[PDB]
Design a protein around this ligand. Structure first.
Ligand SMILES: Nc1ncnc2c1ncn2[C@@H]1O[C@H](COP(=O)(O)OP(=O)(O)OP(O)(O)=S)[C@@H](O)[C@H]1O
Ligand SMILES: Nc1ncnc2c1ncn2[C@@H]1O[C@H](COP(=O)(O)OP(=O)(O)OP(O)(O)=S)[C@@H](O)[C@H]1O
Ligand SMILES: Nc1ncnc2c1ncn2[C@@H]1O[C@H](COP(=O)(O)OP(=O)(O)OP(O)(O)=S)[C@@H](O)[C@H]1O
Ligand SMILES: [Mg+2]
Ligand SMILES: [Mg+2]
Ligand SMILES: [Mg+2]
Lengths: 746, 360, 135
């Protein structure tokens, strides 16, 4: 019962000689955050590192980098003893040698480019026989600390002369390489990688214990997503990091053979993974082998599908084999493969969000050298609809434009192998600014599931509606116990209705931002574009995406288009509304999926939507008042530089009966007047400066930097109301008599 | 289905063993019996694995006995007697119908204003007779395709014959009626196929068919022919005694204060249906939850802003629903059935059976 | 058509010999002319032999990574008739569109083809280039 045996978890820090610990474990273990610890591992191999602190780190777990993890012959979830050692002295001679595979391109220097900035103000604790890694110069490079004269371990001081001359040596056959793929090469998919580790790590770490329990493990894991999102990468990383045997079956490579060779290749893969248990068999591109029953023709294709089903069912009589697979959508797989005892667990890898895209861009720009203006958060906010492969291509294209301009400088003697041109080489912001425009993203039709970025501050007015939406959406998530006590059940749906342009889409986004839930937006034209024989699996697919990503807000915008397409034979409108109604009835509230609709025409809505148990909360969103107009105009003008002279309350008194869209239109029109005036002034000053050279005052400056009362008072003369007064009386009537539409009605 | 329940048990067990490896990971690698001895599966493991489970039979039609008794329904006292004499009597006493020489009827049609308790009655008579119950709604029949509706309607009538004595209940017929005429061919195809299957059905299995409509003016008249749904029961807006019974029925699980006068609420709500009385109960319960969560935020704030309080007394500040909540929820009440509609339903209550000729 | 006119096993081996021969002589360019005769849509192929050639071409395109300095170009009359598994990443992923020429283009074509001829002195090719539309 010792407090020094610890177990490895994933690393957050980026350094090669820093381990992390939580503070109570250090205080029990008598360690301070400047110490120099010694770490023992399997096959009697040990390491030396600098410890620091963390709060996200637990006590039963230590977080260390992959380079330390591979110098200890340790994988994820293994045992390591830690002990303090202030017995570390400085050095005199330290002999390093590169490793033969990483040094086949460059020749010339290795000391000043690589080793010189690495040990400067670092004092990295090294030991004899350790491999370390340096990034820089569009390449990563390995070295091994071969010999220390104060043997065996020391701290690299400026006293130590570092021998970097000799032959790059060969590897030992059990040295784990650093060009392999691990968990740090994957970004933007934290949750899914956690699920796959939970499913897979225990039945492959502990086969004997888990056989001795008597529980069944999973055996079929189907990864799916759009093309190019890193599924082959995830399977390869789980295989390398658990250390299991790994056999790869490729889809076209099996279907390209002749007949009896295809059957025997499948059978040999499953037998060979019997022999070397534990294993992982990865079937890449499954829908080339086993597509739909109606899309196969012949004897050979159906015979291969039946072969694969026999082997998947016969895995039960085997020991410790996981079968993974990958496909671009689940609906094209033969549905007999997704039963029980076959591919029964599904993991969905989607397109990344903004945090994900920044993390991809940081992965691919490791070995490159960036210029000092390049801010990758702006690139990550610009690139929308990019999967990971597109971001890798964008980084590669920017690097090639930089090397092309340096061949515009240096072309004559650049043909030799120089390290200096690589030293000077840098990628500016305009290269990324170029390659952003000449890039063709590939996931724009895909439905986006993310948290929105519209807070409550973008919305002005509407103060009781916000309270009502909190009490509908947020309260049965945070406080389920009150609803258990008082004996009621929460409701499921809301319908917003009202005049055009008053802020319904913004409210539906802001409550999803408030509750930190996902958000799926569907518009009426998107449902009507879905075809005659195609709308069915599509509406079911949207309600499935809502169940997988719960707690969710599923928002049906623009229902008046679906209503107007009925009656001019409008059969597709009736088919879509009936199928939405059936899916709402089937939905059980124990996943916290919450449904919202919105309409500008509350007179032609289908009354069966308003039934209790369906969208039966009716919130009327009206034209704003004078205080509300002041709040709207303040909300739209937060980014614009506005002069002090502007009176907003005067604009609110002058604009009566406007909606929110018209107030935004007035702001847009005034800003165009400002840009026109500025460009006239720049043409006039350029003309005058060029027509009178040698001017005594070279004073470049903003002539008008802000928006004054002239611009708003001119933009006010072109204002037009969007909602006429007869319409205002009709919306006031429906505000009270909408709920009576279900009987005979009107 | 059974395989999903086996997977749910297996997942809960693995979460328990994962938390015990969060405790014991170092020497758990050996074969110990003691870790197995200490090992136990709590309720929160099942509470976890219930949420991360994907069930696989939600589209399947459910054939079971319902769980809605007569006590959930308030009012409607002769309608219950009439449903007993239609459904229960030719099951328990076939000999009387053999003696007196009549034949029992097969169908019932409920009709009336929205929200008055038709679905509950169709479930409660199936609970009373201990028979199976199959519920079909109009949108489910219209979702069935162009070339697909045929075997589906025949499949439902086959499921009714296999599971007899049964109650086969067609809810929401006004959707099938409105889809006719805006070319609404699927509506006419579905109604004609239902009519053919009713004609083919022989009463010697005890299958009993019920329908329900909120729009008794656009119903297809050929449904009302003798031998088809030819018993017409009109279900009206409730009276004052009935409103008292409804409000007592909805509030059986809720903890309600002594101070509340329900007869006052019945006198104040006139022309409401049952759905509106349930809406008033829901609104009052939301006001109670709001008040309780404000009080807990305020006591947490005050207890945390003044540490070392002399009275650590955690307690329900408000455990029940008093007159404030109902009298505030009453100010937002809205009727669902306007008065012109009430006159029209009173007219159809007498002249529905004349729709088969030229009619109106 | 020269590959699809052969018999079955000769078609497979002709594709494979082309990719191996361009391994031997790197750098190279392999030009696959009329791609939509070899690999058309999945719903427009019938049989074993046609799908087996499409799967053969996909295996070779994916296996180019393990090779050195080979570019593969291709040509087709519209992109929508190609089997959509060929336009992923690591396969035919860059598209270049060559359209019909405009008026400056047509004058430049007409100057190319009338090099070796002798024109009379009235022949003004700009009038011809403005006349020919849809060429
Ligand atoms: N999440 C990611 N993080 C980092 N790199 C990624 C990520 N996703 C994709 N990539 C890069 O994109 C390349 C291609 O990804 P793939 O693993 O081929 O995705 P994919 O699932 O194979 O798509 P298909 O359908 O097989 S073409 C990878 O080799 C990485 O370089
Ligand atoms: N209450 C409001 N506060 C601030 N901006 C608003 C408000 N209402 C409308 N806007 C602006 O007007 C635009 C239209 O708002 P939406 O919420 O999309 O309105 P809508 O109800 O969906 O009606 P339409 O038909 O979509 S214009 C928003 O993008 C805002 O720029
Ligand atoms: N007589 C009643 N007694 C008790 N609760 C009732 C009564 N009528 C209606 N309710 C309540 O109101 C809800 C709606 O009842 P239903 O029987 O489904 O009415 P309905 O006739 O089907 O009309 P709709 O269109 O379905 S609301 C029920 O779930 C009950 O909660
Ligand atoms: Mg792949
Ligand atoms: Mg909108
Ligand atoms: Mg009902």
């Amino acid at each position: 019962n010792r407090p020094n045996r610890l177990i490895v978890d994933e690393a957050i820090n980026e350094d090669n000689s820093v381990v992390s610990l939580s503070q109570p474990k250090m205080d029990e273990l008598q360690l301070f955050r400047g110490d120099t610890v010694l770490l023992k591992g399997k096959k009697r191999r040990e390491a030396v590192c600098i410890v620091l602190s963390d709060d996200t780190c637990s006590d039963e777990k230590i977080r260390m980098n992959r380079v330390v993890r591979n110098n200890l012959r340790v994988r994820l979830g293994d045992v390591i003893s830690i002990q303090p050692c202030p017995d570390v002295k400085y050095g005199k001679r330290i002999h390093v040698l590169p490793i033969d595979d990483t040094v086949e391109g460059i020749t010339g220097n290795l000391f000043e480019v690589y080793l010189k900035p690495y040990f400067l103000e670092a004092y990295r604790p090294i030991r004899k026989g350790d491999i370390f890694l340096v990034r820089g110069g569009m390449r990563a490079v390995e070295f091994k600390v071969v010999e220390t004269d104060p043997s065996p371990y020391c701290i690299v001081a400026p006293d130590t002369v570092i021998h970097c001359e000799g032959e790059p040596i060969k590897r030992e056959d059990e040295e784990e390489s650093l060009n392999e793929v691990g968990y740090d090469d994957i970004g933007g998919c934290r949750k899914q990688l956690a699920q796959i580790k939970e499913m897979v790590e225990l039945p492959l770490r502990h086969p004997a214990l888990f056989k001795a329990i008597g529980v069944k493990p999973p055996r079929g894991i189907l990864l799916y997503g759009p093309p190019g999102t890193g599924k082959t990468l995830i399977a390869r990383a789980v295989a390398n990091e658990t250390g299991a045997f790994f056999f790869l079956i490729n889809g076209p490579e099996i279907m390209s053979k002749l007949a009896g060779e295809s059957e025997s290749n499948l059978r040999k893969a499953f037998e060979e993974a019997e022999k070397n248990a534990p294993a992982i068999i990865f079937i890449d591109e499954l829908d080339a082998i086993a597509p739909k029953r109606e899309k196969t023709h012949g004897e050979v294709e159906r015979r291969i599908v039946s072969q694969l089903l026999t082997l998947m069912d016969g895995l039960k009589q085997r020991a410790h084999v996981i079968v993974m697979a990958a496909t671009n959508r689940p609906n094209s797989i033969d549905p007999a493969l997704r039963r029980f005892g076959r591919f029964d667990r599904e993991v969905d890898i989607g397109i990344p969000d903004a945090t994900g895209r920044l993390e991809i861009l940081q992965i691919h720009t490791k070995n490159m050298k960036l210029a000092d203006d390049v801010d990758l958060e702006q690139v990550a906010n610009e690139t929308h609809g990019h999967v990971g492969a597109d971001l890798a291509a964008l980084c590669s294209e920017a690097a090639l434009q930089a090397i092309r301009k340096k061949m515009d400088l240096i072309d004559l003697e650049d043909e030799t192998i120089d390290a200096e041109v690589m030293n000077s080489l840098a990628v500016t912001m305009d290269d990324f600014r170029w390659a952003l425009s000449q890039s063709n993203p590939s996931a724009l039709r895909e439905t986006v599931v993310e948290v929105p970025q519209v807070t409550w501050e973008d919305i002005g007015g509407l103060e009781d509606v916000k309270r009502e939406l909190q009490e509908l959406v947020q309260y049965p998530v945070e406080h389920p116990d009150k609803f258990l006590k008082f004996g009621m059940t929460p409701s499921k749906g809301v319908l917003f209705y009202g005049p055009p342009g008053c802020g319904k889409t913004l409210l539906a986004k802001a409550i999803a931002n408030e509750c930190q839930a996902n958000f799926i937006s569907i518009k009426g034209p998107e449902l009507l574009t879905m075809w005659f024989g195609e709308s069915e699996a599509n509406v079911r697919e949207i309600f499935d995406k809502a169940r997988q990503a719960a707690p969710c807000v599923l928002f049906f915008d623009e229902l008046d288009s679906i209503a107007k397409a009925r009656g001019g034979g409008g059969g597709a409108a009736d088919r879509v509304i009936n199928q939405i109604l059936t899916e709402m009835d089937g939905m059980s509230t124990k996943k916290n999926v919450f449904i919202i609709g919105a309409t500008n025409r509350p007179d032609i809505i289908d009354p069966a939507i308003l039934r209790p148990g369906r969208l039966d909360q009716l919130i009327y969103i009206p034209l704003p008042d004078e205080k509300s107009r002041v709040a709207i105009l303040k909300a739209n003008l937060r980014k614009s530089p506005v002069a002090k002279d502007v009176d907003l309350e005067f604009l609110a008194k002058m604009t009566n009966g406007f909606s929110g869209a018209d107030l935004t239109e007035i702001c847009q029109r005034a800003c165009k007047l400002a840009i026109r005036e500025s460009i006239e002034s720049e043409i006039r000053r350029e003309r005058e400066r060029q027509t009178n050279p040698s001017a005594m005052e070279v004073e470049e400056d903003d002539p008008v930097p802000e928006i004054r009362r002239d611009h708003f008072e001119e933009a006010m003369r072109f204002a037009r109301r969007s909602v006429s007064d007869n319409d205002i009386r009709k919306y006031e009537m429906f505000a009270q008599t909408l709920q009576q539409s279900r009987g005979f009605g009107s």
